[model samples]
Target: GVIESNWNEIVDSFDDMNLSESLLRGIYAYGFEKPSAIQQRAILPCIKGYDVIAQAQSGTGKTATFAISILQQIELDLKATQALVLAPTRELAQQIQKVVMALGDYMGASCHACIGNVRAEVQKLQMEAPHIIVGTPGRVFDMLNRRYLSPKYIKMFVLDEADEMLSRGFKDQIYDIFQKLNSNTQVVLLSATMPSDVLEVTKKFMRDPIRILVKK
Candidate 1:
């Protein structure tokens, strides 16, 4: 296993990550003290715009890890969505959107959720784009193809529940989404398990991503 972990050094607290004080305040206000296990290792690389593959169990602040980087990496002044987050179901996608919004509440960040009802969601985004997009794989692909979502400005692409997403037969849709987006988009995959096939399929599109796995 080339399960490499030689990446960023783990930090002790959120303040050590060089993040905005506003986001730090939001994180503390959201009931966070020490950074989660995964957050400690993953936040830095993701914030540095590196492709990251992280595996950590649920309730270990897995979502918040990428949400921190997603919030940190985004251009608040830019209108178009710079980061796109995909989860399996509607509510799961909604949950990520909520995290990004809550953690970004102090930063005045904008995030939109693309459920099955994606067209109207895109209808609103055409005029004014959010900083991050959280949604399911199916409709997001459709939106990407229909020109509702602009691919030019999206620099960060993240997939939550990556193993389930690939095993549930969303492989083709995900591949298509990857093809439509900018070739240089930063890729981040988060899951409890790191499956070989999942990595195999996405390996080429990703550029030497740092793999971090928490084995408990």
Candidate 2:
């Protein structure tokens, strides 16, 4: 299959994205000098409420690519989980949560890493719903199943390790979560490669996603 990425649609700077004041402040505070090749192309489409399939190298700021978009889209006024992010591991999920927090710091963005003891986590969540959710597939799926974590307010759905998560037996959970999201949700699938398996799954959840691939 082809790369399916549109290099022609790209942003030269983060300012071009017209992000929220707090979101913009958080990025600079986090020491982001300029947008990476992948970030430049992926962030805008994701912010525009467009589904995006982005393929980029690990250190090319791919994590922040989705983080920035997720933060920009989530509603700060609403305490509900407006954005959900899934990673293959608990640690990876936690890591993404940190990035989101770091980026949305000035905006008072709150995120929970839905890992460890599902019941205990649920109890904690009932107290206050975060603006963003970053969690492992199993734990998050459990939350969804028990009706503890409401997908009703989730505007953005992001899969960090798209290929690995799909191949590592999280496909079913991902699919279930996909089905739970509202039709207007923005979906983002990110990985180092555009494997057929990942792309195939996106067609079911994402509607005409803009594909962005950058080796640089």
Candidate 3:
């Protein structure tokens, strides 16, 4: 059975989390002086390798919460995919890559956006072995099946806008990718609203994920 946490605690500042100095520099340089409610609560647990299902309103800095955690977990020295973020759209995937690159600039972590049909570009990313990949489900799955994206080293898999990602059209691809990953990989799902039906099914892939419901 899966367990949940209401996550009623609050974090006042990013420094309070006691993250690496380089990561802190990236966070500050990215123009985030303080942690939002979501960032405050989600970042630490995710960094601790806990599967999480987080819900918050739009424009509440949901992306950065997971982005910061992903950057923190990556090993810049290891030239392999350590994190995977599956977004529903190409624009969203690109935006996630931008955020990751900007926040991880100080740490020198590499991030790639594998969104659309640029097969050559996707192939190039595989050769370089990006530490983090942000892509739409279809393209990401394609890369995975083609063996261009390796899942053995992936420690975290984040489903941004999970409600939509797990819908009928995308859920199959997402599950296929999930099955390919190592059992220890942490799963994080973030969305504004998750239906009970969807949440129930998602629990099958998680191991006692913490649930953080942020009221707008």
Candidate 4:
């Protein structure tokens, strides 16, 4: 499926949004002169509070799309789990969080990583109520249930690498988190591939989601 979004129009809207120059510089340094196809297609609708299941080929610009879309929805001054990213692996969680933060560096944006081997820091840093959170499904869900973190404050929820999560048997945990969402949260699922299970989840959870499938 092809996805269409007015990303450039939306990015332009941020011109007067009081963003820092360093953040703009970082975005430019990363060669983000304009939004990529996925970014351009899905970002606008995302900011408008729409649930999205955007799929693209590997390297078809999924991260860039998510990075920009998420940054737009952030309330920098707020100290809470405004955005949550569920990565399939620990390394990927750190990697994606790095990119997202690097893009928002000028804005003083911070992220909390909830991967294994870093429990104490995870709890401490979480006290700052980072604007964005990136972690594997297991750790993220654990924190949510343990009362260390609250999904009630999350406005944007993202799931990266959908197929990998399914293959790893995180289906039940993923559904549980979705069930706890505050009813108005925006859910985004990105993947290089999708199977029947992914479709079923989308239909059941997402709100009239727009699916963009790109072949590799």
Which model, 1 or 4, shows the larger TM-score? 1
- In TM-score terms, candidate 2 sits at 0.93
For each candidate in turn, the TM-score is 0.94, 0.93, 0.93, 0.86
Cα shift from native, residue 138, model 2 (Å): 1.1
Where model 4 places Cα greater than 4 Å from the true spot, the runs are 1-23
Location of the lowest summed lDDT over 10 successive residues in candidate 1: 117-126
- Each model's C-alpha lDDT? 0.85, 0.83, 0.84, 0.75
Please provide, for model 2 over 1-216, each residue's C-alpha lDDT reduced to its tens digit, 9 standing for 90 to 100: 346665466787888889988789899999998898888788878888888888776788888888888888777779798999999988888888888888887788888888863456667887779889898888888888988889899988888878888778998898888888888888888887667888887877888778777765
Clashing pairs in 4: 5-41
Can you write out model 4's per-residue Cα lDDT over 1-216, one digit (the tens) per residue?
A: 333322233344334333356665767777666665666566667767778887787677677677767887777778777888988898888888888888877667777777875467655864587888888888888888877888767989998988889999999889988887788888898877777887777778787777665555
Give residue 14's error in model 1 in angstroms. 0.3
Evaluated at residue 211, the lDDT of candidate 1 is 82
List the pairs of residues colliding in candidate 3: none
Q: Could you give me the TM-score of model 1 versus the true structure?
A: 0.94
lDDT of 3 at 2: 29
Query: What alpha-carbon RMSD in Å does predicted model 4 have with respect to the real structure?
Result: 3.4
